[PDB]
Structure formats: structure tokens, C-alpha cells
Design a protein around this ligand. Structure first.
Ligand code: FMN
Ligand code: JZ8
Ligand code: LDA
Ligand code: ORO
Length: 370
């Protein structure tokens, strides 16, 4: 509104939404970020809305979800919109072109998206080089100081074993990540998951084990510690599957769970009737929130939750927090609300936390459970 850089951008984004293909719009804004002409949020975040996952400390509770910057080409400018963190990827060991275009469609009226990108990415080696270059800029760029970068990692479509795909990614990019997100949930048994999770924690342990450098020099990342390990879960699961996965997460000592990925359970979006892929945005909100409550329960409140999505407003964020989330990720909100998304949502959450009588954010976590 009053700030002109954000105002001009959000008129422009309105135009793009109306006229221009979604993926094209995405790439255009990625390109504007790469050349550093997006607005900055240079305001101090409220100390009462800080949050953490184990010893990973978030300056504010809002990050950007995976799939947004698949190749880490725009990390600086996206963070500087006011986010405390970003999950780049999903990356795979070798590059993949993804499914035929067009493959991202928006329904403005329901503020929802469907996609069948199919894990398009430049591959691990190139993204690692992109993240390295980010880490070097981060040493020089004051507004990036304590900002977190996680890396989502996945299997190549046709792989000979999932485990070794993940190990290759870890070995390449692990030193530059603050956390690693295991994405084995995506459109486009549980003993298999246990072995995946254990193989990942082991490869990270092995980076530590057999590098001769002190941690200051091995971990070229924000925390200067080894990356935490999270898993991202798809919401299209039966109650038994959820219970089983909960057990695996408890047993492997996973650092956190990202709940949730996109859903294929949505049938009532008119403009999407011909379309396949997973649905994001407002129509996912209730499903994701229900799923957070369930996994919070099934894991005995022992596993920190990263919420995603249908998160647009301060209210949406608080719902996720009170359902059990420690931190929130946005994707669709950036598509529909533009450059101002983080500024506006942080303010709305702050005002809401106060109205509800909460001293801080951490106080609200899980509060809907009695
Ligand atoms: C175009 C598109 C691509 C995505 N790619 C990924 C992906 O690479 N890895 C992943 O874990 N999630 C991916 N997601 C899912 C998002 O990370 C997020 O979980 C989902 O959009 C729900 O959040 P939202 O309702 O705020 O959009 C993608 C979503 C969309 C819209
Ligand atoms: C208009 C639009 C934008 C967009 N993506 C955006 C939005 C905001 C961004 C901010 C910074 C950097 C990149 C960004 C990309 N999409 N995505 C899929 N449809 C679509 N339509
Ligand atoms: C108060 C200064 C601390 C002393 C500096 C020494 C750094 C040691 C931390 C790096 C750990 C190396 N190691 C054992 C994990 O492989
Ligand atoms: O690349 C994709 O198609 C994709 C990955 C994912 O994890 N979620 C999603 O909705 N799409």
C-alpha cells in the first residue's frame, strides 16, 4: 500500500496473473530476483515470534516451501522479501526436464494451484554450485546473516536405488545445507522409509566422521552444524499408514516433519477438472491442518512440525501453530499475494498473537490439543 516498491510490484503481479502463463510468471519473477530488483523487507522481526526446531533457530516463523526455487537461482532475493528460510529443490542427482508444459495452472477464485512439474531440476552438481555461490554472497550480505537454507532431495525417476540417490545428494550439497528434507512424497513399505531415513542420517554423520576440518570449515552453512534431517509427507494417506509412519519417525529419531505436500483428493475445482497433478493453496488448508493434528498426536508431541500449506494470513498461520506446527512455509501465497506476502503475514500473526493473549509464538504451539 504505502510502500511504493511493493505496491508497484503487486500491480505488476496482478497483470501477470491475469494475462501470463504461471510457470512463465514464476520464471520472470525468479529472473527479477536474480538481478536484484525485487523489494527488501529491512524491518526487525518481533522477538516474540522467533521459533526453533531443535538447535535450528528461525528469526521469524515464515519460510518458502520446496519447488519454488528448485535450482537455487534466486535464494538471496526471495529470503530478503522477509522470510527466515527457504527450502530449495526438490533436487535429484542428475538433472530432469520434468513433464510436458504447461504443467502449472492457477484457480484465482479458490486461490489454488495444480501442478505436474515432475521434478524438473538442473541436477545436484549444478544446484550445489548455485548454493555454494549463495553461501559466499551470504558472507558479504548483511540482510542474509542468520537466514536458513534447507535442501529438498529426491530420487531420479528411474533410479536403481532410492538410498544411493539420496547419498549422492548429501555427499555433494550436505556441507552447504542447514537441513535436508527427504521428499519421497510427491505426485508426478514403512521399513523402506526407516532405511531411507537411517541411510540419510548416516551419510551426514559420515561427512562429519571423515572430513579432517573443524566444523567452522566443514559446514559452510548458517548453523555451522551438520544439517538436520526432515521428511516431507503427502496428505493422501489412510489412518493406518499415518500411524505406521509415526512409528518410523519416532524410531529413527527424525529431526522434524514437513506436513504436507500437495493433494490429489480435491475434486471440486471447476477449472481443474481436465487437469492432473497435486493441488496447493486454500483448498489444501483444512486437509493439511487436520494432518498436522493427527501426526502431532501419533508422534506423542515428540517430533517438530513444519507446516505447509494453504497458508495466506496471520490467522491461517496461527491455526497451523495451534495444531502443532513450530514454523510455516508459504508457496501459493506468493503466487496470489505477491512480494508483500511475508511482511503482511508476519504483521498479521504478531497482532493476532497479542489479541489472543499469547506472550510469544512458542506458547501457541500445539495449544489446540486441550
Ligand atoms: C509448482 C509447484 C511445485 C512444487 N514442487 C515441489 C517440490 O519440488 N518438492 C516439494 O517437496 N514440494 C513441492 N511443491 C509443494 C509445495 O512445497 C507445498 O508443499 C504445497 O504447494 C503446499 O503449500 P501451499 O498451499 O502454500 O502452496 C510444489 C508446489 C507447486 C505449486
Ligand atoms: C503471477 C505468478 C507468480 C508466480 N510465482 C512467483 C511469485 C512470486 C515470486 C516472488 C519472488 C521470486 C519468484 C516468484 C515467483 N507463479 N507461480 C505459478 N504461477 C505464478 N503466477
Ligand atoms: C572456544 C574456541 C573453540 C575451539 C576451536 C576448535 C573447533 C572444534 C570444532 C570442530 C570439530 C571437529 N570435529 C571433532 C568435529 O571433527
Ligand atoms: O516437481 C513436482 O512435480 C512436485 C513435487 C512435489 O513434491 N510436490 C508437487 O506438488 N509437485
Amino acid at each position: 500500500s504505502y510502500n511504493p516498491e511493493f505496491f508497484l510490484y503487486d500491480i505488476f503481479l496482478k497483470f501477470c496473473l491475469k494475462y501470463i502463463d504461471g510457470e512463465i510468471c514464476h520464471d520472470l519473477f525468479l529472473l527479477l530476483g536474480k538481478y536484484n530488483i525485487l523489494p527488501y523487507d529491512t524491518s526487525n522481526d518481533s522477538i516474540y515470534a522467533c521459533t526453533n526446531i531443535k538447535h535450528l533457530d528461525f528469526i521469524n516463523p515464515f519460510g518458502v516451501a520446496a519447488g519454488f526455487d528448485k535450482n537455487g537461482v534466486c535464494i538471496d532475493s526471495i529470503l530478503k522479501l522477509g522470510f527466515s528460510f527457504i527450502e530449495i529443490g526438490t533436487i535429484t542427482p542428475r538433472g530432469q526436464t520434468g513433464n510436458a508444459k504447461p504443467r502449472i495452472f492457477r484457480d484465482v477464485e479458490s486461490r489454488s494451484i495444480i501442478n505436474s512439474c515432475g521434478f524438473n531440476n538442473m541436477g545436484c552438481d549444478k544446484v550445489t554450485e548455485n548454493l555454494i555461490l549463495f553461501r559466499k554472497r551470504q558472507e558479504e550480505d548483511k540482510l542474509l546473516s542468520k537466514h536458513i537454507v534447507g535442501v529438498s532431495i529426491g530420487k531420479n525417476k528411474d533410479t536403481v536405488n532410492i538410498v544411493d540417490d539420496l547419498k549422492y545428494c548429501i555427499n555433494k550439497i550436505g556441507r552447504y545445507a542447514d537441513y535436508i528434507a527427504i521428499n519421497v512424497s510427491s505426485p508426478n513399505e514403512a521399513g523402506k522409509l526407516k532405511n531411507i531415513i537411517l541411510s540419510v542420517k548416516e551419510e551426514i554423520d559420515n561427512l562429519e566422521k571423515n572430513n579432517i576440518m573443524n566444523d567452522e570449515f566443514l559446514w559452510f552453512n548458517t548453523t555451522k552444524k551438520k544439517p538436520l534431517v526432515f521428511v516431507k509427507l503427502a496428505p493422501d494417506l489412510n489412518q493406518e499408514q499415518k500411524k505406521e509412519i509415526a512409528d518410523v519417525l519416532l524410531e529413527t529419531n527424525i529431526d522434524g516433519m514437513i506436513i504436507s505436500n500437495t493433494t490429489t483428493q480435491i475434486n471440486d475445482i471447476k477449472s481443474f477438472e481436465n487437469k492432473k497433478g497435486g493441488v496447493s493453496g486454500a483448498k489444501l488448508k483444512d486437509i493439511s491442518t487436520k494432518f498436522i493434528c493427527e501426526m502431532y498426536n501419533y508422534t506423542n508431541k515428540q517430533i517438530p512440525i513444519i507446516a505447509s500449506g494453504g497458508i495466506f494470513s496471520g490467522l491461517d498461520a496461527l491455526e497451523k501453530i495451534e495444531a502443532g506446527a513450530s514454523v510455516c512455509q508459504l508457496y501459493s501465497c506468493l503466487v496470489f499475494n505477491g512480494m508483500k506476502s511475508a511482511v503482511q503475514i508476519k504483521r498479521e500473526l504478531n497482532h493476532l498473537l497479542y489479541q489472543r493473549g499469547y506472550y510469544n509464538l512458542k506458547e501457541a504451539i500445539g495449544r489446540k490439543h486441550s
